[PDB]
Structures are given as C-alpha cells and as structure tokens.
Symmetry: C3
C-alpha cells in the first residue's frame, strides 16, 4: 500500500496509522464571517478501492478561528490527476491570518463502501 504525493512546489512542507496533517500552501487572511478555500498544496494518487476523509485538527479552531464548511471532505480514488490539488473550505468566526506551512486539517484513508443495491419499496 502506497500513496503517491505531488506538492504544488518546493516551498511546501513535506508530509511526515495516525491521521496525517495537511498544511496551508500559502499565507491566507480571512475576515470575520467570510469564507476562503485554503489551498493545501498537495495532490495524491490514493490506493485502489480507497477514499480519503479530511477533518480539521482539534487545534484548528483555537489556532485559527475557522470551521470546515463541508464538515468532512471526501476524496475519491479517481481524483488522482496532475492538477487535482486539495483545498480546505474555511469559514472564519473571527478575523484570522493563516501562514504557509501551518497545520490546518488532517486526513486518513478508508476502504470505499462495498457495492450495494438501492431498491425502491412502497412500505417499510
């Protein structure tokens, strides 16, 4: 089992069964009650049959005052292209400045749901 990882550029902090920390790819300022898609400066080829889940770090709110608007991000195995870079969708509850290289979220991989049949019924 391998993940192939491409970084946006040579300035990106390279990554360390624990969840894996992802970092801002550039300095980003967000005003209170505004939204920004924060680049994470990585693109990955996940193992066949897997998906990645991304959540904030426990410390992200205290450090940065942002929440992740999609709650948990899901990245499918198919999102493996050269320009398929990842982003963190940040809504700021206070004025904030996030710096290049600061840890803001974390990810793990999980096996995709097995194939299931959705069958319509009139009554449960």
């Amino acid at each position: 089992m391998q993940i192939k990882i491409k970084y946006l550029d040579e300035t990106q902090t390279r990554i360390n069964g624990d969840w894996i920390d992802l970092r801002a790819a550039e300095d980003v300022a967000i005003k209170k009650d505004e939204f920004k898609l924060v680049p994470l400066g990585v693109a990955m080829e996940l193992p066949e049959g897997y998906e990645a889940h991304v959540v904030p770090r426990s410390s992200t709110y205290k450090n940065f005052g942002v929440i992740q608007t999609n709650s948990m991000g899901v990245i499918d195995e198919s999102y493996k292209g050269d320009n398929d870079f990842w982003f963190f969708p940040a809504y700021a509850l206070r004025d904030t400045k996030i710096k290049k290289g600061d840890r803001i979220c974390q990810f793990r991989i999980m096996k995709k749901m097995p194939a299931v049949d959705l069958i319509e019924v009139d009554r449960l």
Copy 2:
C-alpha cells in the same frame, strides 16, 4: 447487499441503482427558504432499511456551502440500522450563514454505509 428505500412522495428524485458504490447524493424534498443565522431541518424525502449491522454517515456535499450557504449543525449524521420504520424519514439540519433558498431536488448532502463498531465492554478503572 441491499438498501430498501421509500420515498416521501412521487415528486422525490429517485436514486434507485443496482451496484451503487461511491457516496450517494441526497436531495431537498421541498423548497426551503432559510434566513441568515437561522436554522431549518431540511427534509430529504427518503426513509431506508439499511443492511443488518450497518449504519449510514451523512455529510454535506463539497459544493453545498458554495451553492446554498449552509452548514450541517450535527457535523456528520449517524443513521443506525434500527431507524428503518415507515415514517423514519431523513433530514439535513441546516444552519444558514447567508440568506438562501434551496429548491426541491437540489443535491445538498451525501451518504455512505459503514459497518457498525464491534461489541465493546466498558470496564471502569481507577487509573490508566
């Protein structure tokens, strides 16, 4: 394995599929208007019997905030296999960060199934 799905009514967009394997999109069952900094339980128009020993996880779609300006106040919904009755309909708990209108049929969240955790015994101890 199969999920049995009951729609609220005839106007709900069907998601019936054989061999479905990636997260499954869920839709607003009616038009809903939500005013900035208010909350609405958005019906999704579906009730399901999940395979035995499974649960469902429900999160926003990646585009939900961009399109509709809402967050899901429970973070991730957990729907147990026992929630399988004829009126056990599913809802998206929406908190609006801007004035928004969601229309019947708009894809607002997504789900997958997961096996439920193993039997676990909690043993109280005086120190770790």
Copy 3:
C-alpha cells in the same frame, strides 16, 4: 473488545446495544454566550483497543437542545491518548446563548480500526 475507562470523579454519570454509538456527558455545568466558544469537559479518559481510534460527533439533538456546533467537526482520538490525565473534551461554539448542565448527553462516539500502514511516496507529477 475492551475499553478501560476512568472518570474524573465520583460525581460523573457513568456511561448501550451492540454497535450503537455511545453517549458522552458534560462533566460540569457550562454557560456559553451567543457567538462564543467553550471547551466542554466530558470527564472521561480511556484506553482504546490496540490499533483503534475513536470518532466523536454531536448527537443529532445537540443543536436543537443546546445551540452549539462542534468546531472540529469530528474529533479523532488515537489509541496513544491513553494516559491517566488524558481527558476528553467537546469544543463547542454557541450560535445562541446556552446552558449545558452536568450530566447532559452532548456528543457520541464509536471506535474504528486505524488506517493500514501506507508508504507516502513523493512524485513530481501525477
């Protein structure tokens, strides 16, 4: 499998059908003003099974009851957080003024196997 659990004190409400997520409770009364934040103690520390983690989300009724969201979306607690002072908390942002009482059920957890060991291999292109 076994989870060893230590409570903060005798005043904590002790914590369940097979596989259901397990409710966690406020360790003290907590008042939060609208648009403010508080780390709500849960009053429990645990030794999770080897190779597992815990995931913590709000209960479905948390927002209706208490007007709060969980700022880290889903908390992840690794097996290594098993020490005698490794207590759990729920990071609550209040969207309306609110009051949580000691013993109120506010979030829920399950265990999950940790991801497999995987090699992260840097490449120049995909």
